[PDB]
Design a protein around this nucleic acid. Structure first.
Ligand SMILES: [K+]
Ligand SMILES: [K+]
Lengths: 27, 95
RNA sequence: CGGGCUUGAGUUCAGUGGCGGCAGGCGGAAUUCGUGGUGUAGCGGUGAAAUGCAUAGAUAUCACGAGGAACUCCGAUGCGAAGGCAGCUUGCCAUACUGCGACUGACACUGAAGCACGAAGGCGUGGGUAUCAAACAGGAUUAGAUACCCUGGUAGUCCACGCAGUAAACGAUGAUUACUAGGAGUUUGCUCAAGCUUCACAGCGAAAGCGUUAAGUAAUCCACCUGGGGAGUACGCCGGCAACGGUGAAACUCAAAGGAAUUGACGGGGGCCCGACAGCGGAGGAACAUGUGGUUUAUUCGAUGAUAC
RNA sequence: UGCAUGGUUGUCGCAGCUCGUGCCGUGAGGUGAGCGCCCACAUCGGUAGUUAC
């Protein structure tokens, strides 16, 4: 319950979810 | 005598004539005030008393000035015969 | 291995239930549109405004016609394996709790694989389409505003069938069995037994705390962990229309990353008190005097936010 | 060399600064005695009289 523990997990999910959108409609 | 009020404006309609705070002159942070509602009620009552008809109230919305409008309408010309509340949502549309 | 027993387990019977599931009907309030009475200077919105609707006739107000979505009060409690379940009524199902002097006789617990169900959002085909509303458009505030505020607005939100299989899917606490103290309430079956939540012995714990609904004392089986990043990543394999889901490394890198509490400091977090926030005259504009800073030539040295000049 | 000092000074701008007991906590910690006046100006009442009245 420090709070900073969940910030790293939230941040890497953003990179992963954004990296897939760059090539989603890109055949 | 139908008084339609809200958090922003109060208007009154008698039927024949109508009045509102915006028509009376108040623009912002004053339409929902006791002065503007009574002024609009007096503006409508000036023609209401000079109409040959002498009524029931149909206040619909919640706002600050319904009492002032009712009192002014009763004082000028005719008197408020009955203030029957018609304020109307049994879990209806999502806001 | 061969018999027995009824206490565990199950079957039957009676009583008591219930926002449990599926399906068919019925409803009023609000609200949307279309067509007509009355009527005219605005309405709407905001901290203030504007974009918007409106005299080729608004807001408001009275009717008729066509529709979609959600169920105020009761209402905090109850049910379900979980996800979840709330207008009224009916049908068909399932299930629970309590007891019987009815039955059978250990028929039990757990469970890797597998299978079933599984919020919201999302996908495919066909319907429907009132409100709200991603994306998008315009108006504001800001140095900027790709946001917060306002006005519009398409998917979606609704229904049927089929995919998908995820969540802070949480009590962050797996299932079963037996035992161990008290107080305050509450529901049902009648002082008793089930259930439902907060203070609290022993005990447990690092502490916060848990404490008969244990995180106490014990037994059985399953799931999972072995420092932090890299990383739930890469490769391969399985599944899916797609979105994606499942299984799941290594190279390299660091001496930390963490939990609970204590004292300060801070808060565009609150509370309680006590003084800065009506009058008068100056400075900032001019000329001189004076002290500094700067440049020049030797311009001695020091004092430099309030608290130097 | 005031960033090695003594002694002095300006600010913080001030109402809370210490000494003992017990008790609570695994711990870091929490919670009977000492301390917060002076000078001048006003009124009146007794003594002094010069280079003062
Ligand atoms: K406790
Ligand atoms: K598709």
């Amino acid at each position: 319950p420090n709070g900073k523990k969940r910030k790293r997990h939230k941040m890497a999910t953003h990179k992963r979810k954004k990296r897939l959108k760059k090539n989603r409609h890109k055949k | 005598a139908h008084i339609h009020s809200s958090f922003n404006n109060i208007i009154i309609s008698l039927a024949i004539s109508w009045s509102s705070a915006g028509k009376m002159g108040f623009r912002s942070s004053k339409k929902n005030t006791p002065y503007a509602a009574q002024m609009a009620a007096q503006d409508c009552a000036k023609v209401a008393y000079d109409m040959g008809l002498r009524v029931t109230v149909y206040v619909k919305g919640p706002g600050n000035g319904r009492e002032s409008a009712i009192r002014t309408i009763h004082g000028a010309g005719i008197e408020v015969m009955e203030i029957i509340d018609v304020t109307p949502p049994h879990n209806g549309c999502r806001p």
